[PDB]
Amino acid sequence: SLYRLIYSSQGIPNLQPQDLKDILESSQRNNPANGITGLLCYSKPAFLQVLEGECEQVNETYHRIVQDERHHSPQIIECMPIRRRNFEVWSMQAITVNDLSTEQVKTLVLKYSGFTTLRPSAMDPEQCLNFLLDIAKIY
Amino acid sequence: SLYRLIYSSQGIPNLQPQDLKDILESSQRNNPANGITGLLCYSKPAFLQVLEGECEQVNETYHRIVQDERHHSPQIIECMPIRRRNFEVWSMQAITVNDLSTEQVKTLVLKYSGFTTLRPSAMDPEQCLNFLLDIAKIY
Amino acid sequence: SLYRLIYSSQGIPNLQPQDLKDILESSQRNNPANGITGLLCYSKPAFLQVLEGECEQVNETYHRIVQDERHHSPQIIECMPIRRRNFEVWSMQAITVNDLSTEQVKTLVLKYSGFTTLRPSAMDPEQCLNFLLDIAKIY
Amino acid sequence: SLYRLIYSSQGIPNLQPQDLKDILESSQRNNPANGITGLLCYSKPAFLQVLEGECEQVNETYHRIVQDERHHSPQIIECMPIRRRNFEVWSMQAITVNDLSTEQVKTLVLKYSGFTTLRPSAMDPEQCLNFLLDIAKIY
Amino acid sequence: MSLYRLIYSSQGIPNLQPQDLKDILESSQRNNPANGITGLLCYSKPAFLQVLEGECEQVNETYHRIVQDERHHSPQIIECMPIRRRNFEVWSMQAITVNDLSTEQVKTLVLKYSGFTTLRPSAMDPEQCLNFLLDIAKIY
Amino acid sequence: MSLYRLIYSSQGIPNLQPQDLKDILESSQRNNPANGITGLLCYSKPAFLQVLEGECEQVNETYHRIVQDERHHSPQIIECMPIRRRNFEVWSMQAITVNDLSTEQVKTLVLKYSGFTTLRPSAMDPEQCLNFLLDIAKIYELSDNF
Amino acid sequence: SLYRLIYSSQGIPNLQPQDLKDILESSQRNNPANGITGLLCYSKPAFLQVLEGECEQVNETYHRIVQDERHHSPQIIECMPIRRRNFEVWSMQAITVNDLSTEQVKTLVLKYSGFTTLRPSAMDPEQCLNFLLDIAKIYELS
Amino acid sequence: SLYRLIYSSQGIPNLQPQDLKDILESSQRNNPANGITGLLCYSKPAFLQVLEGECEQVNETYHRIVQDERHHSPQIIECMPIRRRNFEVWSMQAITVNDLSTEQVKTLVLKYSGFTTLRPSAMDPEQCLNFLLDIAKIY
Amino acid sequence: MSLYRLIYSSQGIPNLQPQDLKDILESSQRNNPANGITGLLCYSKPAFLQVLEGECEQVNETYHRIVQDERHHSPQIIECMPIRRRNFEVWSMQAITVNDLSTEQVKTLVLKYSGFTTLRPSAMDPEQCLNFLLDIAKIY
Amino acid sequence: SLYRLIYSSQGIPNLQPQDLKDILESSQRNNPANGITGLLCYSKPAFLQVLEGECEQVNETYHRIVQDERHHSPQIIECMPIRRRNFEVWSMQAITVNDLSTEQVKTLVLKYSGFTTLRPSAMDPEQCLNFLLDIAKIYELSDNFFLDL
Numbered sequence A, B, C, D, H: 001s002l003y004r005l006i007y008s009s010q011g012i013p014n015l016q017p018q019d020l021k022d023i024l025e026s027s028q029r030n031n032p033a034n035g036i037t038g039l040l041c042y043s044k045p046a047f048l049q050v051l052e053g054e055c056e057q058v059n060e061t062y063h064r065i066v067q068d069e070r071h072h073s074p075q076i077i078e079c080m081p082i083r084r085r086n087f088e089v090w091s092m093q094a095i096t097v098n099d100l101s102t103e104q105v106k107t108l109v110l111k112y113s114g115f116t117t118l119r120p121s122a123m124d125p126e127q128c129l130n131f132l133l134d135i136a137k138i139y
Numbered sequence E, I: 001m002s003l004y005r006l007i008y009s010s011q012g013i014p015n016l017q018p019q020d021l022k023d024i025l026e027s028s029q030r031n032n033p034a035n036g037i038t039g040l041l042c043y044s045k046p047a048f049l050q051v052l053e054g055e056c057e058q059v060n061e062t063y064h065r066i067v068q069d070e071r072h073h074s075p076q077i078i079e080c081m082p083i084r085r086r087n088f089e090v091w092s093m094q095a096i097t098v099n100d101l102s103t104e105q106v107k108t109l110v111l112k113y114s115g116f117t118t119l120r121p122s123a124m125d126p127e128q129c130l131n132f133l134l135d136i137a138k139i140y
Numbered sequence F: 001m002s003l004y005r006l007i008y009s010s011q012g013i014p015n016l017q018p019q020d021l022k023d024i025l026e027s028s029q030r031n032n033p034a035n036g037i038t039g040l041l042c043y044s045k046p047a048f049l050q051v052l053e054g055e056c057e058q059v060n061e062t063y064h065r066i067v068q069d070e071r072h073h074s075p076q077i078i079e080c081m082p083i084r085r086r087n088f089e090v091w092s093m094q095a096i097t098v099n100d101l102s103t104e105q106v107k108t109l110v111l112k113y114s115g116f117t118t119l120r121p122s123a124m125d126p127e128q129c130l131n132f133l134l135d136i137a138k139i140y141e142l143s144d145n146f
Numbered sequence G: 001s002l003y004r005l006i007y008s009s010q011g012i013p014n015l016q017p018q019d020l021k022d023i024l025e026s027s028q029r030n031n032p033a034n035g036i037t038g039l040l041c042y043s044k045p046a047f048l049q050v051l052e053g054e055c056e057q058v059n060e061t062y063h064r065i066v067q068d069e070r071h072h073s074p075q076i077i078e079c080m081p082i083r084r085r086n087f088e089v090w091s092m093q094a095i096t097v098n099d100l101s102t103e104q105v106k107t108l109v110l111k112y113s114g115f116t117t118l119r120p121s122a123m124d125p126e127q128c129l130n131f132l133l134d135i136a137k138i139y140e141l142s
Numbered sequence J: 001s002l003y004r005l006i007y008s009s010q011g012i013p014n015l016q017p018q019d020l021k022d023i024l025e026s027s028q029r030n031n032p033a034n035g036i037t038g039l040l041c042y043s044k045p046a047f048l049q050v051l052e053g054e055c056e057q058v059n060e061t062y063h064r065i066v067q068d069e070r071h072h073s074p075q076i077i078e079c080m081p082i083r084r085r086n087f088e089v090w091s092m093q094a095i096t097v098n099d100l101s102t103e104q105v106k107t108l109v110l111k112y113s114g115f116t117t118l119r120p121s122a123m124d125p126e127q128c129l130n131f132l133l134d135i136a137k138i139y140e141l142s143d144n145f146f147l148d149l
Ligand SMILES: Cc1cc2nc3c(=O)[nH]c(=O)nc-3n(C[C@H](O)[C@H](O)[C@H](O)COP(=O)(O)O)c2cc1C
Pocket: A009, A023, A026, A027, A028, A029, A030, A031, A040, A047, A049, A061, A064, A065, A066, A068, A070, A071, A092
């Protein structure tokens, strides 16, 4: 029953800061009732998100997210049953990680990948999860 | 011969505070002589209980409990020999786990299951045990 | 939700070949619709039985069996989720293990226990399951 | 790069044998160019399918499949990188598993689940995988 | 010459007195050092549980002498095997009495490892026996 | 209760005769089967090596009776522990004698598990004792680990 | 000191069957004296090779190979100590893997990758090694 | 694609402190843009270097390094995918290890090798990695 | 008294000839049985590789005596450790020569475990040494 | 090629503190250039020593040591490749372990063997190693010939 899904996506070219906010707010409104928790990362132009909850709800949320016009080319990175949650304190939270980010954040990206800018297509599922767990500790 | 049994059951629709007090008083009277220790949670309408002791005593106790008119449809979740007890401090303790429960407790439910309401049907034996271990810590 | 339960019980002194056949017919009548499979051994006066199927069904069947006048003092030996069935070929089958059994059967009894009569009380869960597995492959 | 996705779905109530022939024809036409292999099972009313190929390809194929009108409520059971393929010999194969199937097949379904009828919602990723591997071997 | 450990349990004769246990301790503290024996004895009326460590020949000589003692019967070897290192090396022998008058802490410890609050070795496996003995040694 | 194995060695008294060995084995055959004891006794003059398997209470009753026997001394428990299943199918009615008059096959077997072609339990570990005993039971078709 | 090195590279655009022959002949000439064994696959335009031998020899051979004007952009996929050889019967053997290959070979390529064309740059070390073992097996020679 | 390569080299006989500084300057200039991290140890006349980064980049850098006239006889000690970086705080750092090194440093060299002087071409992958990690913490 | 194995390599003197190896074998086959020693010797000019099995004391007596032999020098103990059971128990000693004129099957076995077709014990670890000696024993 | 060799031997009857001092002086002279480290214990009449270094060096040193007229009947206890040294701090350390040793040291002997007197023949290689590691941890100085602990 308890499941996790990690996926990456391509946000549309002309995304603004307000759009990230619109996504965060919607997720923070819908997720609690569905028992969904997780963490969303935006590294222009890419999204990386982890979702935790029961299987039915994880799948409902995921398949509804894919219909969002603000991104395309979704790539499911990992989907499996889990023993326990790691993001249970957040309905959803949003972190931007890019070329202007601090050395501490850049060094985390580098720790799990080939460069200092976050590229989900360049990481396996273990590196994706670990990156997310570590970035969760910074703020 | 040292054993653990975890089960869940459906409490009757009528259960008042006094019924929970009666169960707890009975278990605290009977369990010490029988070398039984453990923990009972009530998440309306369901019970989740763990019992530890010598195999014959755990079985005697469990089969007596199944005859109780205050619940039905008992579902053994796990019954196994164990190396050492984990609930040795309590002949029996009883905890209500519901929507009125504290943030800490609700988050613990969420850690091991799809929602913030405790539903033993939604969890495997490992998640049941870990939940019970962690809530026992809180109490 | 796939589960196995193994228990032992004390059959009443009265028991005749026809009682075993009655039990067999009853289990072969009820088990298929309930998705239950397994194996019953009778070693005067002890029974040893393994039940496999969905959690809800295994429990309904088990708790029904305890109510049977023909045995008493049930002892759950193991109850746990399983990856796959081992006794799937029969809804139920019944074997008598005694001094008139084949040498091959007597040897299997001795393999997993202290005497050449099957006494489940003495046997741990791995010994019970292995005995049942071994005797099922000969029959 | 090399990935496998297993999912289940609900087929529309009015599915004919011609519809399964149709689905099979499209997948046998589309899958080779995209390097997709696997197996589809239909147990009325549900589908169970495994897809193998490079991550980008598996994702393209799956997300196209979910936007198909002949089924709904897709539930991804597992999506992960894999060491090597298991269904490489078929671009796609379609097997119907129901109450009319062979006793061999029925016993197989029962080996991995609570019942003789295939119900993916009741199965974990390992049980799904092994069922699909075993039924493929008998075909 | 190999380093060994033997854990066994036995039944004390009815009406063993605190003095008999003192006599057992005194003899063991006199004999064990010269034979290189270390370990721990626990008495939970009517039962004894003892662990002995030392060289194979000495552990065996000591054990088979102990079985001849009129103060207990029906000895049950729980485990006897070569060991990597001792755990009771600081004591030639110690004796601990565990009953219904022992501390809440001790009683909880007995319960952690077995089916009741009185110690019944015949019910515990070798790993439970050793770890109980290790844990009880630690608090005393 | 629990299934157990015990392996021990001892020193036969100096002047032990074939009739004495026969008497021991006649006793063993009389008692062991009824008591659910399987295993084998080996004699490599002047030493004995035996393996007992069965219920813990029974293995212990049998062993402690053996230690009181005036025909041997200085018994050494080599191993005693719970086991998952038996490795000996029967109580072996015969005595296996292992000595300088043994067959080349048997001597090579002794050598396989120890420093010499004569069986010396004091120089073997529990695994070596167990495997030697299993292998020789197999050679004598008494046998074969189920 | 026994080692394996697996790498991939880009063959030159103007590569001909004759060049494949010269490489194989040079390899068969040099490899025995240096204790090198292994296997070379060519999937236009890519080479995939495994080399086994003493670390010093594997490294001498590898670094000489990278200087060859017949390929560029070498990608070491794995280099590590090994317990025993897996390709000891061949000093060097060459196999072309393409669209004219047997269906059995095509199916083998698919078993370890996304497509029926061999693309080394899309296979992890375990996949490369297992592909090469399997393909050596379906072929023959010593 | 995240990789690590460890190798050893023989520096030319004539190398001066200025040559080492030139190597370091070049590497700190080039490595960042290529996402390369690591550590270089010089134990006259030998080099031992660890490189981390994307497979393509590690390989580009490595093969460029082998073309350098200041060293010869390169020996790849290990090259493999990695879970995460261990260097990463450094584009590149250089440490000289010799007869004038600290007692602590000489004892570390001895801990991993036959002598107080580092002989890179004599240590296995595990010894190389751990030596490098250990000496990184000392400085 | 512990059962032991020791594997070592050495350098034979330059002028060694077939008779020398025959004298080594005959001496080994004479001495080893009474000492309970088993094993196998390979000579790959100029190198010897030998495995010895037996009781710790005897393995050591034999080895330290072998090292005093004028027919070889620079001995390198490759491994020495207690063992669970013997693998060469059927031979007091055997001697095998492995050279550039051995069978291809033997030369390939050499190659399976090392950098070359000539046996060089210095080029192999304890596992490769043991496995080679086991495999070459089986094919003889 | 990093190796460890542990052996025991019987010292000749007459050995004096000066003989032990001579052995240590010799080992501390030779071991450094050979990259050898380790630890020697003397429990009259027996020696127990562990040597670490490159395989060739451990072997050269060992076989030279067996030629020493001050001991006989050497018994190799274990000889095998190692991943890392454990005795790297001293080219050689030497400790007398006997019945005039401290209770702390006697308890260590008992921890790994039948008695409080060190008898290498009564210990398996893991016991020898761990005993040597534990004694290395509590000493100190390069020897206890001048001052104990
Ligand atoms: C990258 C991305 C991630 C999203 N994650 C979530 C999510 O975690 N939970 C959620 O409810 N909506 C998520 N959404 C937003 C939903 O797609 C959609 O806007 C929402 O269902 C609309 O809810 P509303 O109509 O109540 O505002 C995400 C959107 C984007 C593009």
